[PDB]
Design a protein around this ligand. Sequence first.
Ligand SMILES: O=C(N[C@H]1CCCC[C@H]1C(=O)O)c1ccc(Cl)c(Cl)c1
Length: 130
Amino acid sequence: DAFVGTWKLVSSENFDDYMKELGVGFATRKMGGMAKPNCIISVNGDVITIKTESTLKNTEISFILGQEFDEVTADDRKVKSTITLDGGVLVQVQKWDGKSTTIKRKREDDKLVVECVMKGVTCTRVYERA
Ligand SMILES: O=C(N[C@H]1CCCC[C@H]1C(=O)O)c1ccc(Cl)c(Cl)c1
């Protein structure tokens, strides 16, 4: 839709703080911070697929909006995720061990803007078309 495409990360703010708040260890934060992933988003009726591809770690989710699913995240958390569409924004919540983090994906101009919140920490990642 607005989201379908192959996207390449062009900027990141506060991603190390974000990962540290998730409880990601130093080695994994090191690798993750200097990754420059692509994000490939596709849709086939009700099912949305989000692939993230990077030199050191690939991940893939497929989901239906409003249907909770189990996910293993890039840092190996086992979480329950639910994604919904709210005012044109794809809102993802991950829940695990009584904690949650939210990931909002929005289209702004040319770009795919991803805002990641964990407790007091807010990280913004910007992708442009590949
Ligand atoms: O799961 C990732 N990223 C997602 C989920 C949480 C942060 C926002 C979003 C993003 O990066 O836009 C992920 C996957 C592989 C790598 Cl190698 C990296 Cl570095 C990150």
